[model samples]
Target: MAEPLTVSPELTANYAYFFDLDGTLAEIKPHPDQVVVPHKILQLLDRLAAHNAGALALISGRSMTELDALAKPFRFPLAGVHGAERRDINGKTHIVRLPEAVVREVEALLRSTLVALPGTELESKGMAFALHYRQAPEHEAALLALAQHVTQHWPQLALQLGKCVVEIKPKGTNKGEAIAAFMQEAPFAGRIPVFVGDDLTDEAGFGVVNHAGGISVKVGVGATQAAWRLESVPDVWRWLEQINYP
Candidate 1:
């Protein structure tokens, strides 16, 4: 891996920023609903995009709608549902259309299987659904096992693991694909790429960025393909601020 580079407004302006939301930008909360995005964070993102010439994108496990709500008054190109849904900076959206029946089936599986586990819940993303075990960390093993069990009955679904959650989505999608797709288009094309994320899910993005000879940053610890590491959420924001142009 290459040595970590110092973040600079001028240097970062020449690169595209692909960021993970929960752990990279906001502190991970016990419940997804409880996660907070401070006004300053959004402000910083808006400026970051501006400086980067709108090359900033939020690559997250969240649903597009959920991201819209979380971002509130801000809008940046983003890939949601593990890249099952994407909206370009120009507002073009190409979202996978999951069968209506299967979506309901997933919901039903959640209602039935998750009922036995207290403090765990299901989050619906149009093309995917996540089983959040954050509030019930002790039930992690059971939740993971249950997810595996349920997925056995649904070949069309694939499991994606996160901090303390598991997502079941259509088999053909991931964050790496999202970044690659964005790279082929404007604002992102012809620029250096930088992927910043904190989970295993983001590993796919890290691989893609590395293959492109771009920078990949890992937040917190675990074995990762990322070329750089930041200690915590605060370090991520500090880096973002440093790379922001006044």
Candidate 2:
């Protein structure tokens, strides 16, 4: 078994860090909007970003708008909506646009399909939308099929399966591409890449970081290709708290 990772000098100073917000940084909430950022983790992110010269980023499935709201005033670089949207280290935002006509078409399909499913909800990501069945796990297979059916009409769009969620995003975007793109920029360029997450979508990121000879961490328990583990979300913060202070 590959050992779990903890903060160390090299982990802090020479590595570009990537974090997955929900299951990795915080416990998964029934509703995405209900997630709260603890002050300690928020402060830790601020210092990590500073010490790494702005190489720390939150890579999430949430929209950039949602992430910005959660990080509030901190605006660390982020890959949101499964990388369909990005805000770079230089504080500039970028998006891989999905055709609006196609987006609206899917939106309509989802609204109509989920209209009567009292527990199912659809989230608008601007560039994408997600069908969350967290409150209706029994509807997973049906929701997945519906999402696939809806996206099949537009070959340019794609589907990502996450924890009780089905995401429809532009085909070319993913967390792997997002991390690779960041590796090309300042502060991040040439630094060892370290990515951590606890969902199926994060596997793409784990794959990318593995190929780069970087650190890959998996949170909680599940099948993973990550070279390391952190048993729980609190472990993630404990590791963060141990990073060398600048």
Using lDDT, give the best candidate's number. 2
Clashes of each: 0, 0
> What digit string (tens of lDDT, one per residue) describes model 2 on residues 1-246?
657776554434688999999988877788887887787788888988887888999999988888888888778899998888888877788888777787777788789878888789988888888888988999899889987886787888788999889988888888999999899998899899999899988999999999999999999888899999999998888888877441
Residue 192's C-alpha lDDT in candidate 2?
92
How many clashes does the backbone of model 1 have? Answer: 0
Q: Which ten residues in a row have the lowest lDDT in candidate 2?
A: 4-13
Regions more than 4 Å wrong, model 2: 6-12
Error of 2 at 102 (Å): 0.7
Model 1 spans with C-alpha error above 4 angstroms: 1-12
Candidate 1 on 107-162: residue-level lDDT in tens?
Answer: 88777877887988877777788888877899888778877876788888887888
